Each structure stands twice: as C-alpha cells, then as structure tokens.
Amino acid sequence: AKVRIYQLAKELGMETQELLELLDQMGVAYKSHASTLEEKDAEAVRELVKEQRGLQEKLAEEERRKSLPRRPPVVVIMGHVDHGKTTLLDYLRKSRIAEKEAGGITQHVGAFEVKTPQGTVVFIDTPGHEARGAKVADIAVIVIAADDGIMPQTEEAIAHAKAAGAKLIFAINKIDLPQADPEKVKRQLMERGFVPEEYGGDAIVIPISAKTGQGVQDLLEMILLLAELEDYRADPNAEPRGVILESKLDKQAGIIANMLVQEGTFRVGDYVVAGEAYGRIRAMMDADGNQRKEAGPGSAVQVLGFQELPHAGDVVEWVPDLEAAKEIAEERKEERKAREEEEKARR
Numbered sequence: 115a116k117v118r119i120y121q122l123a124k125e126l127g128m129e130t131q132e133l134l135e136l137l138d139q140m141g142v143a144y145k146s147h148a149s150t151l152e153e154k155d156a157e158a159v160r161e162l163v164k165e166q167r168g169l170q171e172k173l174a175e176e177e178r179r180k181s182l183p184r185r186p187p188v189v190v191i192m193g194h195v196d197h198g199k200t201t202l203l204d205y206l207r208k209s210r211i212a213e214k215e216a217g218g219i220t221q222h223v224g225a226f227e228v229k230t231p232q233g234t235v236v237f238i239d240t241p242g243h244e245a246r247g248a249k250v251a252d253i254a255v256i257v258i259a260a261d262d263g264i265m266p267q268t269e270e271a272i273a274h275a276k277a278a279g280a281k282l283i284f285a286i287n288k289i290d291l292p293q294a295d296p297e298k299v300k301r302q303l304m305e306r307g308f309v310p311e312e313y314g315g316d317a318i319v320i321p322i323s324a325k326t327g328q329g330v331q332d333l334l335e336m337i338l339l340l341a342e343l344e345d346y347r348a349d350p351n352a353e354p355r356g357v358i359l360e361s362k363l364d365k366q367a368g369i370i371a372n373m374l375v376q377e378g379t380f381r382v383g384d385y386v387v388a389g390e391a392y393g394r395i396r397a398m399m400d401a402d403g404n405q406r407k408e409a410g411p412g413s414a415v416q417v418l419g420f421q422e423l424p425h426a427g428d429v430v431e432w433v434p435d436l437e438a439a440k441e442i443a444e445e446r447k448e449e450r451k452a453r454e455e456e457e458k459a460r461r
C-alpha cells in the first residue's frame with residue numbers, strides 16, 4: 115500500500131487489461147496501469163475477484179453434476195425349452211473368468227457381470243422362467259434354435275418382453291448343426307414383422323452357437339452398442355432404489371435377499387423396506403464374494419438383515435429409520451389384508 119495497478123494484477127494472477135476492465139466496471143478511476151490504488155479500492159478488488167472466481171468454480175461444479183454417470187445394461191434371456199438359454203448363460207458365466215485361481219468367490223447374487231473392453235454387461239441369472247413386478251431388464255435376448263425355429267412359446271417370450279419394456283435382440287442358436295437353417299428363422303421373423311437390420315429393418319439378429327461360443331462376442335458387442343444408443347444412466351446420489359430378484363433362506367444365515375440396485379447407493383446400516391418386508395442391512399455380498407460396504411447402480415448383491423422374505427420383483431426402498439421402515443411396511447400389510455377380505459365378498 116498504496117499498490118500500483120500492475121502490481122495488484124501480478125498478485126491476482128491477472129491481466130493488466132483484465133484488471134483495468136474490472137476497475138471501470140467497479141467505478142474506480144485510474145490514469146494508466148501505472149497508477150496507484152487506494153488500499154480501500156484494492157481491498158475491494160481483491161474481494162470482487164474472490165466472488166467472481168468462486169462463483170465460476172461453483173457453476174462449473176453444478177454443471178458437471180447435471181451429467182449423470184452411465185450404468186451397465188441389464189440383460190434377460192428368453193426362449194423355448196431346449197433352445198439353449200441355459201447353455202448360453204453358463205457359457206457367458208464361463209467366459210468371464212478365463213482366469214483360474216477363482217478365488218474369490220462366485221456365490222450367486224442373482225446376476226453376473228461380463229466385462230469387455232467395450233463395456234460391462236449385467237446378466238440376470240435367477241431362472242424363474244417368468245411366473246407384474248418392477249422393471250428389471252433393459253434388453254431381452256430372445257433365443258431361437260436354428261434346427262427348430264419359431265414356436266408359439268417364442269411368440270410368447272417376445273410378447274412378454276415387449277410388454278415388460280425390453281428392447282429385443284434375437285439370437286439364433288445352434289448354428290453348428292448341419293440341419294441348421296438360420297435364414298429360415300430370419301424369414302419367420304420377417305413373416306412376423308421383425309425385419310433384420312441387414313434388410314433395412316430395426317430388428318437385431320445375431321447368429322450364435324452356445325456350444326462353440328461362435329458369435330457370442332459379437333452378441334456382446336451388439337448389446338453394448340444398443341446400450342450406448344439407449345444411453346442408460348443413473349444417479350448414484352439419488353434416493354436408493356432397487357428390486358428384489360430372489361429371496362431365500364439359509365439355516366445358519368436366515369433370510370437372504372438378492373437385489374439389483376437401480377438408483378442410488380445402498381450402504382450397510384441403511385434401513386430398507388421391500389413390499390411388506392423391511393429391515394436393516396446387516397451385510398452385503400457381491401457376485402465375487404466380496405463383502406461390500408456400498409452398492410451403486412448395476413450392482414447385484416446379497417442382502418442380509420431382512421425380517422421377512424421379500425417377494426421377487428418388489429422394490430427395495432431406502433428409509434431413514436427403523437420406525438419408518440415399520441410404518442410403511444405395516445400400512446402395506448393393512449391394505450393387503452383389507453383388499454383380501456374385499457375378495458371374500460365378491461368371489
């Protein structure tokens with residue numbers, strides 16, 4: 115003090131003409147950048163530069179938080195009995211560790227992930243063969259055998275999947291067999307109004323062999339492709355929301371539930387309600403057997419601590435406290451009771 119303008123500028127990491135512009139907006143009059151500033155003013159300048167810069171760092175932050183991270187595609191497999199669903203799932207579950215040493219673990223949490231350079235894909239395991247619930251799968255892979263073709267069962271699977279909001283992918287399996295005619299199946303698909311992309315339609319058709327592994331990598335790349343196109347994303351910071359895949363019992367363990375996380379992040383100690391089932395999460399284990407402290411979108415984990423058994427397809431919801439988990443769970447019990455005895459009246 116009293117500081118010259120070119121001095122203050124160097125101080126603030128600023129440009130002479132930057133600071134001069136600022137003084138004019140500020141109302142402080144100078145002669146040239148050589149001029150001296152009253153410490154009153156310089157103190158104001160130092161302050162304003164904090165305001166403006168802090169706000170810009172703030173606006174940049176809110177800017178990036180508008181952009182939500184992606185999430186892996188969740189895939190279900192459908193089809194007609196004998197057409198190779200099971201064989202395909204096993205293969206996919208084989209193809210993940212071509213690394214032996216395990217370890218480490220492979221328990222079954224209801225879904226598994228296949229990591230590719232192009233991305234990670236999540237596969238529902240849990241065969242129930244359907245049974246409504248809450249949306250689980252983004253994509254359905256409809257499996258068809260090339261020696262058999264399209265059965266009414268396949269027509270059902272296709273109808274179901276669309277009704278469930280799934281984007282369809284048609285997999286033509288068993289192409290190793292000499293009696294296999296994939297073109298026949300394509301014709302059947304077109305006959306039914308699904309036109310493959312090679313003929314200019316929007317249907318996706320990948321010939322594969324679950325036995326040999328032919329075209330399975332291509333099937334994977336196509337799933338990830340349609341994922342980018344659909345652009346699946348989720349907010350890890352939202353109110354945690356997920357869905358129950360399967361919930362079973364274990365003698366020493368008790369009630370366990372497999373859960374897919376959809377939005378948010380569940381952590382240990384969170385109180386959750388699923389349908390009429392509530393509880394506190396004691397522990398969480400993934401497909402790798404790792405005990406997890408936190409779970410974000412795309413994660414299939416096994417949850418310990420439910421008081422009842424949650425039904426599959428039921429939504430898992432975060433709640434602040436045990437009491438809130440209890441009231442919500444209880445109210446859903448009331449309505450179900452009442453609406454049950456309402457079915458006593460009308461048969």
Ligand SMILES: Nc1nc2c(ncn2[C@@H]2O[C@H](COP(=O)(O)OP(=O)(O)O)[C@@H](O)[C@H]2O)c(=O)[nH]1
Nearest residue numbers: 194195196197198199200201287288323324325
């Ligand atoms: N040749 C051949 N057989 C297959 C292929 N995929 C599955 N299979 C056979 O199809 C039979 C029944 O299929 P499966 O795995 O049980 O699937 P799912 O019946 O639809 O649940 C099994 O004996 C498999 O070995 C394939 O790509 N090629």
